Structures are given as structure tokens and as C-alpha cells.
């Protein structure tokens, strides 16, 4: 049954292996004859599946790598906390948050870079930060620096503990294979233990520490006069004065009359007027409910006892109209190969990150976060980029599994075979829908441009000539506006202010949130989003499905997952491996994410953000020209790229010069990438031949003969440089513009 199984000292810690490189693979271990050897030593460093074949060693290596990664993350967190404690102006920002810019980095005075120490405010000079850490610390209840120092020390200690644990589990006591394959216990502990207890404990902290300190802060008291958090725990009088319910203690909870706790566990919803964030009582209530739900749901699978459920029984016994026998051999597939689990987890994490970004810009969960425009922009863009990258990687790992871990003899699955047997219909229909969507979505813009250039503004697809309104979205907005009165009797207001109707919420003369209207431009942009998403899905799905074999190459599995081509014959067979399909899909993911972030930035700068006056009128940043100027490509090039780049390029001689320097550097790297993307290997090898002759003429030729990069390495270098250049350009442009004008 379920038990702990370990092996004692599988490997011995010794420096002998460090002396010689490439010990994992024999062909690497032989010795270097050409430079290519070096480039291989890094390519197969983490290819644990190809070093050996036993599952036990792979699992142990995976565990140790996870521990190392956790240690690195803890070290990074400790460094951030120590920087916040030592070189920062947190205490100044605490008293006057609206007129002080956060900053936690100070530049030395070595060469002339001291001009980077801009005057953020509050008697401090330093680089303004846009990580949103200050809002997190304020919402946590931290009001000093000693607490931050203690947190940093604890983080360092935790990093050391994680490193020791990784070493101990790889070199002293290594879990056996049967320990890993016990997924029922893993799921039970991950649901009930990690997600339930953690959120319950955080709810306890929020109820006991964050709520009273934040109440005192919002009441207008000076930060240096607020009582320390432990005084609230020790003294019941202070809590009773702040909340009378605590005077009754824990008696009501055991008596099931929970309404007595309605003082600090509410259901109002909406945004708090003082700070423009969600009510902390609602957040604590939500955390408590989530804890209860997760603790309940973590006791579903049978482990070592009579009660519970079996995953294999659930999968096998499920009979449906469309599936049939269906899920039969999926349990072995998902418990035998690591790559399938990696693919599913990567897809789920990417989707979760994107949803996180959307929900976080929609409803600000931290105090004084909505009015900080740079923080919002940075958080949204960063999280969406991360989600896109993870979603892309999922397909690559699925292709790896399909290539090297799929055999129909020992493990057979009906649904997978049924999907494989009719791939042509899937690909054909996906291709047709992609063509149709792209044709319509881009033809609308081209038609708008052409009718504009000919002096025919009455034949456009616009808000005045021919209208295409998103009626369904408007209906949903109206239903959500009307919901709190009838559909949600408990909720006092709307879940978020984004839905049409309601009132503007502004903090300190700056607009925090107001309803976002939808028109023709939103229709067109959403259809463009759908088109790009569909094309990326088509590329990745084709790469995954046609990995094992194709009509052109009937034996593509033998060649492997990473092979440049098959030869000049058959008319040319370049880029048929699934790796090349991933390399092609990266560009389209980049395109889609760039378009989406551009849309979000322009819409927010045009129709939401701005300034409010004493009289009551609202003046937006760009004057609300998105509704009429974004229906043509000329409008996107002139009113958005040309107009908003003034702050980036005219930042020389000021405290934002680094942004312009990075703006130029990203352009240089993007132009550099085309050198690898466009050319071929033979020319470079033939040039290196003459260079090597010139070297040998002077008796300075090396023993490791130079060799041009392989084809796959060239493509990888090209795509890496391209992505880095584009992302850095967008980063510099966004940050400079939103810091200057926001």
C-alpha cells in the first residue's frame, strides 16, 4: 500500500566528476575534437530522458532540480525584501502615497551615471520601480523597516534550507519509484494541505493583523503612531473598540450564529472609495470560503484506507454518448511519461496567468494600485507575455511525448488513435477558418484605408457610415449592470465597475475606474485577436499531429524530434520536424501578444485613465480618439506609434535616458537577428576556411578546429535574438511613455 520507500546513498558526493565535463553522455565524455562539442554540452544538459532509461534516476534528478529552483526563487525574494528595507523610501511613501513615486534602487556615482538618480519625491533620489511591491507591503500591514529586515533574513534561511534539502534528497536518501507513482496521496496533500491550509492561514493573518492596521492607516493616523500588530493579539480591549464582535470571542462560531461576525466579514463588493481597491473584509471572507472548499475537496481519492475514489476506476467506468469506452489506457500514459504531465501543466499555467492578468486589471485588489498607471501597465504586459510563452511550450512538450514516448503495443488508447486517424479533416477545417477569419478581419481595415485615401469617408466600416456593433457584449454588460438589484440580492453593488452603468470612482484627483464603452473598433480588434489565436493554434496543432509520420515522409519518427531536414529531394524537405513547427509558432505568438497589449494600452489611455477636476469634468490622456482613429492602419501608425514615441526619444539628458538607450539597443538586436535568420551554413563554413588558412600561416591555429553553427542552432539563435529585440523595444517604449505622462 502507501508507504515511504527510499534508497540510501545512491550517489557519493565527490569532486572527481567536476574535473571532466560532459559525464552524462559518452559521446560528449570522449573529448573535444571540434568546437561543436562545446555547443552540444549545453544543449543536452537537462535532457534527463536521454542520459539513461530508468525512471528512478529521472525522477530523482527532477526532484533535485525542483529543490534548486525553489532555493533560487527564495534567494530572489529575500533580495527584493532587503532592497526594500535598506535602499528605499517606503516610510516616506507610506504617509503621502499619491504624490510620491516608489523607488528602491540607487545608482553609484562612478562615471556620470549619477543622472539616473531621478527625484521621485519625499527627499529621495533613485530609480523609480514599477513592480507594485509597495502596494503589497502596505496591504500586508508592514509599517516599518525592521519587519522587512526580518523577512529578508527568513527568506535567506529558507533558501539555505531548500538547498540542503535538495542535496540530502539526491545524495543521501532518494525516494524509490513506487513512491513517485502514488498520485492519489499527492493529489490529496496538494489539495487539502498546500491549497487549503495555506489560504486558511493567510485568512487568519488578514483577519488578525492586516485589517486593524489598515483600518488605522485609512483613518488618517500617522504610521509611526499605529500600535504594533502583536498588541492587537495581546490586548482584547483595542480589538473590542475597533470591532465589538471580537468581544464575544470564539463563542459565536461554535454556536453557528455567524451573523455576529458580519462586522469584518461582509459581502458588499465593488471598490473602496478611499483607496480604490477591493474591501479587505471581502478578501478575507473569500479566502476563508476558499479554504473551506479546498479542505472539503481534498478528500476525494482513496489512499491506504477503505474510503475514497480510484482514479483508474473513474477513468475506466465513464461511459458516455460521444466517448464510449474511450478513456481506458490513459492512466498508464499519464503515470509513465513526464512529458505529458509537463505539457498539461504548462497549458494550465499559461491559461491561468492570462486569466490572472485580465482579472487583476479589471478589479484592483491592492490599495492605491488603480491610480498607479505604470504599475498596472507593467503587470498586465508581463503576465500576458509569461502566459503566452508557457502556452507555446506546452505544444513542444506534447510533440516530444508523441515522438519518443508513444507506442501502440504495450499502451493503447482509443481516443488518441481516433484523433490520429483523421488528422486531415481537422487540419483542413482549421486552415479554412483561419483563412476566412484573417481575410475578413484585415480586409475591413484595408477597405477603410482605401475609402479614406480616395475622399469617401461615407463608405467606411465606422461609427457613422456603416455600423458593426458588438450587440452580445453590450447585452452582457447590461445584464451585469442589472444583476446586483435582482440576480445578486446579497451583493450591494456590481462585482466590477467595468460593466456599463454606475458611477465614476476616482482617488486623489485621478480617475481610478469608469465603465468602458464598446463600439465598432472593439468589434474589429476582437476579431483580429481571434484570427491570430486561430493561426497559432493551427501551427502548433499541425506540428503535434504530424510529428510521428506524414504523407511526404512516412518514417519521420526514426529521424527524431530535432532534425533539420531530410534532403534536397522530393522537391525540398526543409523544416519538417516538430521543433521547426514550434520555432515557427513562436513568431505568431509574439505577433498576437504584441497586438493585444497595444490594444489594451491605447484603450486604457484613451477612454479610462485621465484626470478629474473640482467641477467634475474628466480629461483623458489622449482625448478619446481611439473610437474614430483606430479603424485604419494609418491611424494606428500616426496617432499611436508616432505620437506616443515623443517621450521615449526626447528623454536624452534627463533621468529617463536609460529607456532611450534600451530603445536603440533593442532595435540593434532585432536587426542583428535577421543575419542568422536569412543566411545559410555553407557560406560561413567556406569563409571560416580562408580565415583558418590565414591563421595557420602564422602558427596560431588551435587544436579545437573552428566549425560553423549547425542549422538548428542557427535557427534557435535567430528566433531568440528576434524575440529579445522586439520585447525590449516594447518594454522601453511602454515604460518611458507611462512614467513620463502617467
Amino acid at each position: 500500500e502507501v508507504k515511504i520507500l527510499v534508497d540510501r546513498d545512491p550517489i557519493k558526493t565527490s569532486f572527481e566528476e567536476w574535473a571532466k565535463p560532459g559525464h552524462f553522455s559518452r559521446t560528449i565524455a570522449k573529448g573535444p575534437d571540434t568546437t561543436t562539442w562545446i555547443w552540444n554540452l549545453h544543449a543536452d544538459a537537462h535532457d534527463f530522458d536521454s542520459h539513461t532509461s530508468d525512471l528512478e534516476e529521472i525522477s530523482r534528478k527532477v526532484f533535485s532540480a525542483h529543490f534548486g529552483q525553489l532555493s533560487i526563487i527564495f534567494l530572489w525574494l529575500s533580495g527584493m525584501y532587503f532592497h526594500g528595507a535598506r535602499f528605499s523610501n517606503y516610510e516616506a511613501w507610506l504617509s503621502d502615497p499619491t504624490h510620491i513615486g516608489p523607488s528602491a534602487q540607487v545608482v553609484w556615482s562612478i562615471v556620470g551615471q549619477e543622472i539616473l538618480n531621478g527625484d521621485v519625491g519625499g527627499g529621495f533620489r533613485g530609480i523609480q520601480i514599477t513592480s507594485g511591491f509597495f502596494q503589497i507591503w502596505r496591504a500586508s500591514g508592514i509599517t516599518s523597516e525592521l519587519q522587512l529586515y526580518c523577512t529578508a533574513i527568513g527568506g535567506l534561511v529558507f533558501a539555505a534550507l531548500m538547498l540542503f534539502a535538495g542535496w540530502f534528497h539526491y545524495h543521501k536518501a532518494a525516494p524509490k519509484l513506487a513512491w513517485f507513482q502514488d498520485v492519489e496521496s499527492m493529489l490529496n496533500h496538494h489539495l487539502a494541505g498546500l491549497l487549503g491550509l495555506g489560504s486558511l492561514s493567510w485568512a487568519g493573518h488578514q483577519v488578525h493583523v492586516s485589517l486593524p492596521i489598515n483600518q488605522f492607516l485609512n483613518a488618517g493616523v500617522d504610521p509611526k503612531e499605529i500600535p504594533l500588530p502583536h498588541e492587537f493579539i495581546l490586548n482584547r480591549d483595542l480589538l473590542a473598540q475597533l470591532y465589538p464582535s471580537f468581544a464575544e470571542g470564539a463563542t459565536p462560531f461554535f454556536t453557528l450564529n455567524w451573523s455576529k461576525y458580519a462586522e469584518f466579514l461582509t459581502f458588499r463588493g465593488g471598490l473602496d472609495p478611499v483607496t480604490g481597491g477591493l474591501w479587505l473584509t471581502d478578501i478575507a471572507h473569500h479566502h476563508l470560503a476558499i479554504a473551506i472548499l479546498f479542505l472539503i475537496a481534498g478528500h476525494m481519492y482513496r489512499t491506504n484506507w477503505g474510503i475514497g475514489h480510484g482514479i483508474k476506476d473513474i477513468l475506466e467506468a465513464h461511459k458516455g454518448p460521444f466517448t464510449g469506452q474511450g478513456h481506458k489506457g490513459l492512466y498508464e500514459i499519464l503515470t509513465t511519461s513526464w512529458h505529458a504531465q509537463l505539457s498539461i501543466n504548462l497549458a494550465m499555467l499559461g491559461s491561468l496567468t492570462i486569466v490572472v492578468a485580465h482579472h487583476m486589471y479589471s478589479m484592483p485588489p491592492y490599495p492605491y494600485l488603480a491610480t498607479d498607471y505604470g504599475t498596472q501597465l507593467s503587470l498586465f504586459t508581463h503576465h500576458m507575455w509569461i502566459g503566452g510563452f508557457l502556452i507555446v511550450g506546452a505544444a513542444a512538450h506534447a510533440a516530444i511525448f508523441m515522438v519518443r514516448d508513444y507506442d501502440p503495443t504495450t499502451r493503447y488508447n482509443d481516443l488518441l488513435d481516433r484523433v490520429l486517424r483523421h488528422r486531415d479533416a481537422i487540419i483542413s477545417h482549421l486552415n479554412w477558418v483561419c483563412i476566412f477569419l484573417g481575410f475578413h478581419s484585415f480586409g475591413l481595415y484595408i477597405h477603410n484605408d482605401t475609402m479614406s485615401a480616395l475622399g469617401r469617408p461615407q463608405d467606411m466600416f465606422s461609427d457613422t457610415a456603416i455600423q458593426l456593433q458588438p450587440v452580445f457584449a453590450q447585452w452582457i454588460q447590461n445584464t451585469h449592470a442589472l444583476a446586483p438589484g435582482t440576480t445578486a440580492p446579497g451583493a450591494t453593488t456590481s462585482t466590477s465597475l467595468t460593466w456599463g452603468g454606475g458611477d465614476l470612482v476616482a482617488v486623489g484627483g485621478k480617475v481610478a475606474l469608469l465603465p468602458i464603452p464598446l463600439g465598432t473598433a472593439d468589434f474589429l480588434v476582437h476579431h483580429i485577436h481571434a484570427f491570430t489565436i486561430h493561426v497559432t493554434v493551427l501551427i502548433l496543432l499541425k506540428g503535434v499531429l504530424f510529428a510521428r509520420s506524414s504523407r511526404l515522409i512516412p518514417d519521420k519518427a526514426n529521424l527524431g524530434f530535432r532534425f533539420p531536414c531530410d534532403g534536397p529531394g522530393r522537391g525540398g524537405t526543409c523544416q519538417v520536424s516538430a521543433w521547426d513547427h514550434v520555432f515557427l509558432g513562436l513568431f505568431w505568438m509574439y505577433n498576437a501578444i504584441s497586438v493585444v497589449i497595444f490594444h489594451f494600452s491605447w484603450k486604457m489611455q484613451s477612454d479610462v485613465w485621465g484626470s478629474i477636476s473640482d467641477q467634475g469634468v474628466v480629461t483623458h490622456i489622449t482625448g478619446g480618439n481611439f473610437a474614430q482613429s483606430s479603424i485604419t492602419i494609418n491611424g494606428w501608425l500616426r496617432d499611436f506609434l508616432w505620437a506616443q514615441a515623443s517621450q521615449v526619444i526626447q528623454s536624452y539628458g534627463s533621468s529617463l535616458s536609460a529607456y532611450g538607450l534600451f530603445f536603440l539597443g533593442a532595435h540593434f538586436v532585432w536587426a542583428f537577428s535577421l543575419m542568422f535568420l536569412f543566411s545559410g551554413r555553407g557560406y560561413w563554413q567556406e569563409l571560416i576556411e580562408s580565415i583558418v588558412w590565414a591563421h595557420n600561416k602564422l602558427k596560431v591555429a588551435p587544436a579545437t578546429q573552428p566549425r560553423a553553427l549547425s542549422i538548428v542552432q542557427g535557427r534557435a539563435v535567430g528566433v531568440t535574438h528576434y524575440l529579445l529585440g522586439g520585447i525590449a523595444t516594447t518594454w522601453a517604449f511602454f515604460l518611458a511613455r507611462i512614467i513620463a505622462v502617467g
Binding site: 535602499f87 528605499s88 523610501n89 556615482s109 538618480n117 527627499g123 529621495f124 533620489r125 533613485g126
Partner: peptide, 11 residues
């Protein structure tokens, strides 16, 4: 806040 900035310029 002044001391934090001065920590960089001690030398």
C-alpha cells in the same frame, strides 16, 4: 530617506 540615499555615497 536621506540616510538610505547616503549609503551609496559613503565613499
Amino acid at each position: 530617506s536621506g540616510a538610505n540615499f547616503a549609503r551609496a555615497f559613503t565613499v
